[PDB]
């Protein structure tokens, strides 16, 4: 049950951290990328890494060489990882130890994709059979729905899937079905309802037929406020057509473990797909929460998605730190965040199907590492998780890359592309152009354009500063073969273990989220006040004034 | 033609800036919001502002009182605006002076929505008649398309609109049609194609019929690389069905002024909708670029959208700085950015239809103010535009508000809601819950939760730090009546003039974008290399290694 004291308290107390500060002061802050490339023709070989995807038998190239790194920098960052016990915490997580120390819970999303059925246990009880049982249930169900064997209450094939859930019950399913759309069933329409704002469920239902719509109600407790309200509104709409509550069981399933609330809702207990307490929402697309993915692309493709993550898990678990890809990604984030003062982290996929990949990573990263209390209960003496943001390129280029190239912020940036398109329009011309931007953007950010080059091209002398690009703006480039299910699984797992590495160095809990509870408590209180004539004055003057303005504009007593 | 020397060089040289630094050092950095509210029951009255929308006869409440502001702070920020000549530059912009000093161009998006036909001129020639001529053309065309008078080459009514364009030719149309969807034609499907990635045009065309699809090709020059390629791919698909190039003229129109390239493409010159050089892309949805909006919601609603922006223009132009709403928003951004070190700016609409509003603002803000050269040609001695980001709430709450509440960054935040929903599902329950989160999130971020409150609620003593909320996290709350076309127009114009105010104080050009050109030049070069056997070695070692890896994975010599 109880375990050891943490290995350290504050990251700033580790000797390697102090060495990194001295390294920054003397050298790191003076790194000029184009000078290092001029002087070291082997720089790309030194700081690139290749990951083999054994599922689709391809390779993903991770190029870190346009980052603020020397061989000495890398040595010190790996030293910091060792002093912070990154490998020990990682091994604890894979053993099923309760490394989520504020909730006394294991952290076992890695067990969800344990496709080789390696021994995995929590509390000295294997989890493998239970994980596999749910997956088999998911397989059977998706086969039934996709084949048309599962029929609506009037005997029709299901053609609309409507997922209802918040946060991690929504963002993964959205992003993965969008990313893997070429694998999706041609006759299937998916809606993802998540906001409590009634516009969301309304637009989803407006263009759906109760006779051919299947609802997935995603909530471990089946008492999540927003999801319960959306789920109830969906049921009301359904019954307005189906009338008999017995038909619910053909049109609603539950991604949940609260069998009492599920059956009370009207769902047959045989149609709950459970996921464990040690599955965090932002780490849950691999679990029953992925059922909408398996419905859309088929179970075999979902399993390949799992297996790609598993190949990345193996890389993370077995690779020495110097060559360990997610570990280097995490250490770079610490380096930029805590020694260069970068408050943000850009991720830009040169891939339109991945348009919701940055929003997914934003929850993974910021909800994990937006923390300030160490394992020892102290307030951190250094900044933790960045604001993670992005849009797909080339759209992002035409929106905000102006600031990336000529603004006054250091913005560590990850660019991601597949070498092959699922839609090679016009003899590959679109894809060659996409590729040219992927390659040129990192080049441009690194080399810039000197005032001398600018003037050489004929610029008015007094516009030269406006057209100068300082360069020396770092990037990481990730080149996959093709975005298949397994390659996507490996890419997500990269960012999961990057996020793990950050939190291990910072000595924070990447796996709780106590920071969401105050808003929920205060919202429920205010909701009762909105429902209560004359109430709403027990707040600060701003909240009271807004609440009153709202009551007046919305016609509430 | 030529005008005066700028009023100042570096913002840091203004006396009011120095006073703000002294104010920060002595007082501003010690502001604790909950203490100021405890001591000043009139704080909400002092620092809130009300904007009347005369188009839909409603009021929008702007509450700035949960910001790091005292009466003295406000006095000094307004003083800084006066020393930086914010009103003078604003008046110059409305006069049509060439305030875009690096391109010698006026900045006249305000003329696009000059619905009262006030006198407006550039270079001593009125622009009003030309603006109105295009709008009348837009009106006629949209009436023809929506009524079915405009028919495809087989005589069918147009049911699919496909907009093709990049950056400002895409983001506004997307965000506005999404935001105003309740006003959209029930039988109309819109696709917005922007990425050069062929997946974008492919998915749009997959589910479209050439006989009922109308293309809007949005590009001033009609030689924009990405847009031209997408437009050509669209035409190829069209002709594969229509065969006769003469049918192009019934299915392609141009938002452009290059009549030679447009007709060469096959578009009838009578179907170009022009917009002026003094319309910036990120300020262009008000122009011909808004044609997809007018098609979807009708011209009268588009004109109301214009008129709401016009009401905000009037407020910006006529209101003394102390009560001027966009000016206060801009000054707060400078205050947080340059004196508190905040690198980011969150905008979270509590409104799912506005889900693409943050991405629109991200271009408006970052492409405008991601700049480092003053009007006098010097490199700024202070940070300029933030990274602007966000997602709609409540989704955002479940994604990254953990970091907002308990992370280690100062994140100035704007929350936006309408008091009324277009979709008041379940007797307003969804909307009362949405409202409760809008109100509670700003409350929670301000008041936090002390260790004493935490322990009072029964938390384990050694979890108290993990469940503590420090509070004192500032927000701005914007409460509209309902998101109508005019209210949305006023909200965008708020952010346009906020962005104006920032750049005026920083002494940068909010209206150029020289920072996009290096990526374009280097991409075209690399594109030729990809098309050339044996070429691609003339780069730094990283770009060369990536280019080679790409050629190998993509089967290029
Ligand atoms: Cl080196
Ligand atoms: Cl800190
Ligand atoms: Cl005050
Ligand atoms: Cl700077
Ligand atoms: Na900037
Ligand atoms: Na650059
Ligand atoms: Na010139
Ligand atoms: Na695969
Ligand atoms: Na943080
Ligand atoms: Na808080
Ligand atoms: Na306990
Ligand atoms: Na209106």
Residue numbers in the entry:
A (entry chain A), B (entry chain A): -3 to 553
Publication passage describing the model:
Phosphoglucose isomerase (PGI; EC 5.3.1.9) catalyzes the reversible conversion of fructose-6-phosphate (Fru6P) to glucose-6-phosphate (Glc6P). Furthermore, Glc6P can be converted to UDP-Glc, whereas Fru6P can be converted to UDP-GlcNAc and GDP-Man. These three nucleotide sugars are the main precursor molecules for all cell wall carbohydrates, including chitin (UDP-GlcNAc), galactomannan (GDP-Man), and glucan (UDP-Glc). The AfPGI protein contains 553 amino acids with 71, 57, and 56% identity to Candida albicans PGI (CaPGI, P83780), C. neoformans PGI (CnPGI, Q5KLU5), and Homo sapiens PGI (HsPGI, P06744), respectively.
AfPGI was also crystallized in the same condition without Glc6P, and the apo structure of AfPGI was solved by molecular replacement using the AfPGI-Glc6P complex structure as the search model and refined to 1.56 Å with an Rwork/Rfree value of 15.7/18.3. However, we unexpectedly observed that a citrate molecule (buffer component) binds to the gateway of the active site and is also recognized by the phosphate-binding loop in the apo AfPGI structure. The phosphate-binding loop adopts an “open” conformation compared to the structure of AfPGI-Glc6P complex and therefore places the citrate molecule proximal (5 Å) to Ala221, suggesting that the gateway between the active site and Ala221 is ligandable. Compounds bound to the gateway are potential starting points to explore specific fungal inhibitors. The intrinsic flexibility of lysine implies that the Lys520 sidechain is likely to move away from the gap, in agreement with the fact that there is no electron density around the Lys520 sidechain in the structure of apo AfPGI. This intrinsic mobility of Lys520 could leave an empty gap between Ala221 and Gln523.
